Amino acid sequence: MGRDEAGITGTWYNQLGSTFIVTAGADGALTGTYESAVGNAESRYVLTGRYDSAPATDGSGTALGWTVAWKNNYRNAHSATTWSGQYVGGAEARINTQWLLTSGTTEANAWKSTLVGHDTFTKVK
Amino acid sequence: MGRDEAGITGTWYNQLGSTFIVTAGADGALTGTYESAVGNAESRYVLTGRYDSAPATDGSGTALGWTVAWKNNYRNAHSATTWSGQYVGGAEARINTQWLLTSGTTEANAWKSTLVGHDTFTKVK
Amino acid sequence: MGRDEAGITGTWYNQLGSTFIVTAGADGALTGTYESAVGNAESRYVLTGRYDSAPATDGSGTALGWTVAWKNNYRNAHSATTWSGQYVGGAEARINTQWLLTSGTTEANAWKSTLVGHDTFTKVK
Amino acid sequence: MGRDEAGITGTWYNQLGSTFIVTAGADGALTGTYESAVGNAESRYVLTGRYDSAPATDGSGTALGWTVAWKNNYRNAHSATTWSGQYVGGAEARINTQWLLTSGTTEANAWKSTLVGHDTFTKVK
């Protein structure tokens, strides 16, 4: 029922070699797992998010976002990343994102709590 | 079972007058609703996210994040915001966040797709 | 000749206790020194930037930005911060900024090169 | 005298087709002009910034930043962009940046004042 429900659902890979496995629900839900190739992380972590299930039809992307808290049964990096971006469908489908990675800190160190970057996900490689 | 499960769960308000209603699950889940005082928005929107259910005990905050896609039964702003931040417990509990608001755009306009800002949530006002 | 040349020029302090000393030139230039209360820093560092010397008159802020590279005669933190924001004049003048702090890294660590945050500068305290 | 003074100085192009013309001073200064291929802009605008004139030698990049206020003799977009990033030398030299573009706004619209994105500059194309 979601316009890009089928186009978003599946396995995605970014430029770092991370793997994003997502299911897009008819209603706007995103659920899945994330495995980072880098950082204080091992194996899969739960993700959840949301996407625009009725996007504009005018060649525009589909807005979406999701979160990973970096705790699983193997490790806890006391941090969470949120990706915010858009899905662009077609032969070379992509999800283009910017992210914010916040660590738990003391109040004295909160100024240095948050990393920012950008990931591009593709269906191959 | 989550360390700040009780401290996070409930109603939060930010500096804009927005209202965040969240339940924190024992496992790391965040679910709830968001109502923005500003922007292309009306009434409540679904949110989901994650938090560190076993944070450091050393005076450090609790990392968390969540997403809203700005589609509900009233409006669709073809956009999604992700907040990334930390919960700081105590008499004056706060959630301190930075956010990324991505709009669906054409590829030609993707350079101007994403707003960034910061919200502080409190339990009063 | 700059509309807020007089309002911007002078000494500013942020919420961390840092001190920003700036001169605004008629043409749009910003020059001065920055002293951070936090981080890998001591004493003053050179800053340069730019501001909108002919802003809108409609109650709107004045856009501006500036950079500090964190090298001086005392220390080198192999990093640079840029603040991007707006000057809001009046009894309680403020400069409201967001910043990006990039460290030199290897290519393998570039994903974790860049911190993001927000500073508010006032003329007192 | 700056380690990458020679490597930074010159003409750079980003993925949008914008042109960055910079001189790096021995002392850490960056001066030049920027011409954007997109947005509310025409022709060249003054830029100034700073870079780490004595970077780490260990395969690490060179931290730098610069600002453009989007006022010149042709147009005034009441905004400023700051790029924060690192120069990576070698056969395929690059400057990898993240940026913050703040517009002057009323206080009521300040939540939507600031765009964020990422530009990669190369010496060709």
UniProtKB/Swiss-Prot annotation, chains A, B, C, D:
Intracellular or extracellular location(s): Secreted
GO molecular function: biotin binding
Main location: secreted
Cell attachment site, short sequence motif: residues: 50-52
A cellular component annotation (GO) from this entry: extracellular region
Domain Avidin-like: 5-125
Binding locations of biotin: Y34, Y45, W83, W99, W111
Keywords, sorted A to Z: Biotin, Secreted, Signal
The protein's assembly and partners: Homotetramer.
Record family assignment: Belongs to the avidin/streptavidin family.
Function: The biological function of streptavidin is not known. Forms a strong non-covalent specific complex with biotin (one molecule of biotin per subunit of streptavidin).
Protein name: Streptavidin
Source organism (scientific name): Streptomyces avidinii
